[PDB]
Design a protein around this ligand. Structure first.
Ligand SMILES: [K+]
Length: 227
């Protein structure tokens, strides 16, 4: 069962993260980005019980975009790539270079598919196509209502097509719905605009939860400013 595979590979991946170096802080493009990076992590680690830190979607997205696929995939080990492949319902085989190729190949398929779906509208998809679309992108889908599948897929498309959040980081962040209750980071994502709506949509709520999974990955690794 996929659910089975996702629970074990997620839990394993979360273990690996605690000692992974996924980004090189000193190789960040420019000086303004480095200070954003410093501010973000300083803020992250200042959170504590009775001292919850809130992060804007746009605040998180700028940091998230520094964890680029090329660099992240090259930094993942073979066991991490294997677990990541299985989580994405692929059959991993070969050396780490081949695993990277299979994952990249898949992300290209997903890219071509995302364009199609976004142009036609998620509402044009059948129940069965929604289910499959979500599985392929690292999203639950199992036991999930059609409407919720639609909203999940809309969230994925906004973050990928419009916010440009790196897809590998995205997949890794979604493993945090399959643990393994996440280690509390006392941090939370929000959109100022959405917080002023008389009613936030399920989409808006799902968008916050997604950014929260991203924060969860960012709180999982060793302090990037030290390592
Ligand atoms: K925002």
């Amino acid at each position: 069962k996929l659910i089975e595979i996702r629970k074990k590979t997620s839990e394993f991946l979360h273990e690996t993260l605690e000692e992974s170096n996924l980004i090189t802080y000193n190789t960040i493009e420019n000086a303004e980005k480095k200070q954003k990076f410093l501010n973000f992590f300083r803020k992250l680690y200042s959170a504590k019980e009775g001292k919850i830190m809130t992060f804007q979607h746009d605040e998180i997205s700028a940091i998230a975009q520094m964890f680029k696929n090329d660099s992240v995939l090259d930094n993942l080990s073979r066991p991490q790539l294997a677990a990541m492949s299985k989580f994405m319902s692929l059959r991993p085989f070969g050396n780490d270079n081949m695993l990277r190729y299979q994952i990249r190949s898949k992300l290209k398929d997903i890219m071509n598919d995302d364009k199609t779906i976004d142009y036609e509208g998620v509402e044009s998809l059948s129940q069965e196509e929604l289910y499959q679309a979500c599985v392929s992108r690292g999203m639950k889908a199992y036991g999930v209502s059609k409407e919720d599948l639609v909203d999940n897929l809309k969230v994925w498309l906004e973050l990928r097509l419009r916010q440009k959040i790196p897809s590998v980081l995205m997949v890794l962040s979604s493993t945090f719905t399959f643990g393994g209750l996440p280690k509390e980071n006392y941090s939370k994502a929000f959109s100022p605009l959405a917080e002023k709506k008389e009613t936030k949509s399920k989409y808006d709520d799902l968008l916050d939860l997604y950014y929260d999974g991203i924060l969860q990955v960012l709180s999982s690794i060793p302090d990037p400013v030290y390592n």
